[PDB]
Amino acid sequence: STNPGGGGGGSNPDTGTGFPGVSSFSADGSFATTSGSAGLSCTVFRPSTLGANGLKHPIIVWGNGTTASPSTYSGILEHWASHGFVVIAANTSNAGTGQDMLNCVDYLTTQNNRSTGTYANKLDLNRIGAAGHSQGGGGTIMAGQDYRIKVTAPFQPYTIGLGHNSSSQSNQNGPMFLMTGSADTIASPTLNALPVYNRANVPVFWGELSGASHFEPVGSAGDFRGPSTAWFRYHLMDDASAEDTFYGSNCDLCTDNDWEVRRKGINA
Structure with missing residues (x-):
């Protein structure tokens, strides 16, 4: 939480990659957002203007919980987009293998590499993360083996069925x-x-x-x-x-009694 700008009604400084600072991680950020279909089988939530001010946008790829669609999570996905992320959700309700999530990454790579278009030279392909709920949290772990996935955030992953291969857990990037x-x-x-x-x-x-x-x-x-x-x-x-x-x-979560924290490999 510690910020030299002090947060609140102040103005926190830009991040290291040049994105606006924020006074809250739970409140929406400063980017107006839009959403729509991407590549037939994905849905993007993104800043309505990409690439202003010389920025290249980091990406979060999302996997839905079992039975769910991107609309089930529209609040969290729009929220990340309002902070400056390009968020791409696989449409599938069956995200457990991780393959749909990685296909959405392949799609955005193609678009970044075009000469013109929504994403042309506007994405930071070195700053991709993965997240998802339930089976999609298992799928996040499956996708998280890929060298392009820098970090993961599985929300309540389901790893005992629905496409999961537990060996993926020991092969994260x-x-x-x-x-x-x-x-x-x-x-x-x-x-x-x-x-x-x-x-x-x-x-x-x-x-x-x-x-x-x-x-x-x-x-x-x-x-x-x-x-x-x-x-x-x-x-x-x-x-x-x-x-x-x-x-x-x-750390904030470490002293927050609403959380039980177990870490490994994290400076403590």
């Missing part, structure tokens, strides 16, 4: 912000998340939110919204103010 809810009886954290924490080959920040059901991530994603935004702003925008959300002995 980058660090993981693993989120669970203590009231989640559908993707039991003991069965679905504890094994990921144990076997992951990367640093893991595992936060379990007290009193969160399996439906906390739907819509605007509740009390996961701010933390997930901090994670992606830190790693994909070099927002230094998000560092002490996760790192150090006195």
Whole structure:
């Protein structure tokens, strides 16, 4: 949380990659947003103007929970877009293999590399993260093996079925912000998340939110919204103010009794 600008009604300085600073990770940011279909089988939520002020936009690829669509998560996806991310959701309700998510990344790469178009030279292909809920959180871990996925944020992942291959957990490309809810009886954290924490080959920040059901991530994603935004702003925008959300002995979530935190490979 620590920011030299002091937040609030002040004006926090730009991030390391040049994106506007924000006074809150849970409130929407300064970019007006739009959404629409992308490549037939994806849906994008993005700033309505891309590439202003010399910026190249980081990307979050999203996988839905079982039975769900991108609209089920429109609040959280629009929220990230309002901070400056280009957010691409696989449309599928069956995101567990990770392949649809990676196809959405391939699609945006093509568009970035065109001479003209919505995305032409406007994306930062070195700053891609993955996130998703439920089976889509398992799919985030599956997709997170790919060398282009810099960090992941699985929201209540389901890893005991629905396309998951648990060996993916030990083949991640980058660090993981693993989120669970203590009231989640559908993707039991003991069965679905504890094994990921144990076997992951990367640093893991595992936060379990007290009193969160399996439906906390739907819509605007509740009390996961701010933390997930901090994670992606830190790693994909070099927002230094998000560092002490996760790192150090006195990190924000570490001293917040609403969270049970288990870390590995994270400076503490």
